[PDB]
């Protein structure tokens, strides 16, 4: 047709019955007999919607082996792109736009081997797509978590990989890139593919001439104890995306960001970094950071109540230890102050992640912020940087909670706090908030003098009623008296319904819901401190490896030796 | 322990229908189009050699089971 470009092949294609057209036959008959087939068997739609569509993909598509062989047989091009705007990223179903990726998607082996190893024309396994995705990327990619979808794409993807490595022993595909830079691996770990990182870190491929596929190992074996070994390869460090790098520093929208730790190597990983070299750094920083606390404090208690700053020093010993405090409180105001401009600058965030993640730099920049307010009134002859300064100071302490990580039972109940703040009390405070101005512009008005003449007095006077510090004594000659009691009892009533609301509503959050996120929230905090510790590190020496250089295999398909800084983990079963 | 919470969430849907269905019947301003995805030939093969047009609604779905 002149519209889309759809010939008679594709037409008999589209319109078979029990698997059989015989008008197909007669037309490549025809076509073999006239001028020649290969223009005619290639034929494919023109228009955008479906733009590179051929035979091959219809062939696939209807799951008919024999018209699949037929193809391949009268020169079809296997390696033919279907690039419409239905077959990427609306409508639309994304396989990877080559037949290789369409018959792998679908779960149809036979077409995948006879593709790959037929006697015309063989598909090219490395091959890839406009947006750089190989076959392997094409299987992450269609990934939804699923117990049946995690079954056959495993399965796929073990039967490509080692066909792969059967045609190809030089090939590895595993380190092929996208126009991204991602692998399989750091696709799988960036996209919240939960099922294929587990199934990749910890594979087993024992069969002749591709046991190096493997990335988990057998070290030895007594009885029911037995020793294994996990790759890490590209686990900790391989200065492009590592897992872990992945995992911490992703953007809080992928699904599974808690749940990506608690797989085996991971976890374990983790812990022993810990335990380490990490912990004694992060309690040296507590111990600096509650030493500077003191020495702020003491520096503020004893400012002098003298008039129009700055004020001289005396040649006496309280004024030098007083001024070399407030000279150690600034500098540590403007450490934090470029300490947080280096995070926002090193991360790029979009106020999005700062607005859901990343609390305690905007809560440390702002500390540092009010001390320099604090400097620039001091200098400017003001009394008003005392204002600024306690601002600073008991915010200061607040902080100190960030320091509850890196001991367990501190920092669930510090994350506890953080998510009841963020997620309930919200939804009250509005509520209440609503309520109050109301009731306040109600007071007011009603009565236009004597403790309820502003806006701001009668809120307070009201908002201490919630707090049991009320006044009902009623001594005052009002002219709407007895009238006030009835809207100061109907406030009481309700503002004690809305906090009654509030406590049950946070009891039904109590059904296990918040222990077990808290218990994996703290986990990644603590693995955020661990990299974010590894990143800094202030010596300038690169040593320190996590688990030793051992030989895995020693033999590749080549001759050489095969070292991969295994992970040793030690493993009892009594089953057998 | 369990009630509230799914109750809650089906009044607030009910709510909502209500809402929906009292914007849409009065809107003071006389806008009709309020159909939907519009006269697809759902069939065209009546038990008479006439077509049949309904104002379907279109869902999407995926399953790989087959
Ligand atoms: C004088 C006036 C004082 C007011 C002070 C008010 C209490 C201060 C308490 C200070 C405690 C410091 C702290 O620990 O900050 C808390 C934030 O608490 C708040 O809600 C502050 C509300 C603004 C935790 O935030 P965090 O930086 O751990 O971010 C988490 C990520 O790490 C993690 O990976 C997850 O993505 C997780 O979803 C993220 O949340």
């Known amino acids: 047709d002149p519209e889309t470009g759809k010939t008679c092949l594709l037409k008999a294609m589209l319109n078979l019955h029990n698997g059989q057209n015989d008008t197909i036959a007669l037309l490549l008959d025809v076509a073999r007999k006239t001028d020649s087939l290969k223009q005619f068997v290639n ?23 024999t018209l699949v062989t037929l193809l391949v047989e009268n020169g079809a091009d296997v390696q033919a792109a279907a690039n419409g705007d239905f077959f990427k990223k609306r409508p639309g179903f994304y396989f990877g736009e080559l037949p290789l990726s369409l018959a792998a998607c679908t779960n149809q082996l036979a077409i995948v081997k006879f593709l790959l190893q037929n006697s015309w024309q063989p598909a090219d396994i490395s091959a890839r797509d406009s947006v750089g995705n190989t ?112 995992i911490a520093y992703s953007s809080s929208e992928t699904p599974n960001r808690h749940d990506m730790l608690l797989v085996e190597p991971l976890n374990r990983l983790l812990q022993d970094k810990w335990d380490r070299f990490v912990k004694r750094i992060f309690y040296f920083n507590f111990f600096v950071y509650c030493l500077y606390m003191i020495i702020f404090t003491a520096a503020a208690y004893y400012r002098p109540v003298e008039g129009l700053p700055p004020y001289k020093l005396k040649n006496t010993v309280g004024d030098y230890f007083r001024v070399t405090g407030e000279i150690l409180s600034v500098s540590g105001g403007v450490y934090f102050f470029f300490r947080g401009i ?36 001091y200098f400017s002859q003001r009394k008003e940087y005392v204002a600024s300064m306690v601002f600073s100071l008991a915010m200061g302490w607040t902080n100190m909670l960030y320091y509850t990580r890196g001991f367990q039972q501190m920092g669930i109940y510090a994350v506890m706090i953080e ?20 009731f306040s512009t109600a007071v007011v008005t009603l009565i236009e003098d004597g403790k309820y003449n502003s806006l701001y007095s009668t809120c307070l006077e009201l908002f201490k009623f919630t707090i049991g510090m009320g006044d009902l004594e009623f001594t005052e000659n009002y002219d709407f008296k007895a009238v006030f009691i009835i809207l100061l ?4 009533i309700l503002t004690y319904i809305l906090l009654l ?26 693995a955020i401190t661990i990299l974010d510790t590894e990143k800094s590190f202030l010596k300038c020496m690169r040593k320190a490896f996590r688990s030793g250089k051992l030989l895995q295999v ?14 040793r983990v030690d493993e009892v079963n009594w089953t057998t």
């Open 43 to 65: 034929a494919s739609y023109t228009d955008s919607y479906y733009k590179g569509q051929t035979a091959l993909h219809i062939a696939i598509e209807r799951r008919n082996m």
């Open 135 to 246: 076959v392997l990327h094409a299987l992450v990619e269609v990934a939804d978590n699923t117990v049946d979808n995690t079954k056959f794409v495993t399965s796929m993807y073990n039967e490509i990989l080692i066909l792969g490595a059967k045609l190809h022993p030089t090939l590895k595909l595993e380190e092929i890139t996208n126009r991204k830079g991602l692998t399989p691996l750091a696709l799988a770990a960036s996209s919240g593919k939960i099922g294929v990182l587990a199934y990749i870190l910890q594979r087993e491929i024992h069969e002749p001439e591709c046991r190096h596929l493997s990335r988990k190992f057998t070290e030895w074996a007594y009885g029911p104890v037995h020793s294994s070994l996990y790759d890490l390869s590209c686990i900790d460090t391989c200065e492009k995306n590592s897992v872990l790098e992945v």
């Open 342 to 377: 280096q995070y926002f600058l090193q991360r790029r965030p979009s106020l999005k992640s700062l607005f859901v993640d990343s609390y305690s730099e905007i809560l440390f920049f702002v500390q540092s912020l009010f001390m320099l307010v604090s400097v620039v009134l």
């Open 419 to 438: 998510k009841m703040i963020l997620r309930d009390l919200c939804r009250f405070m509005f509520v209440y908030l609503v309520f109050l101005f109301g």
């Open 489 to 492: 009892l109907a406030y009481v």
């Open 501 to 526: 609301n509030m406590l049950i509503a946070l009891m039904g959050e109590t059904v296990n819901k918040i222990a077990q996120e808290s218990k994996n929230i703290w986990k990644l905090q603590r």
């Open 554 to 567: 020693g033999f590749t398909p080549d001759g050489k030796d095969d070292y991969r800084w295994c992970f």
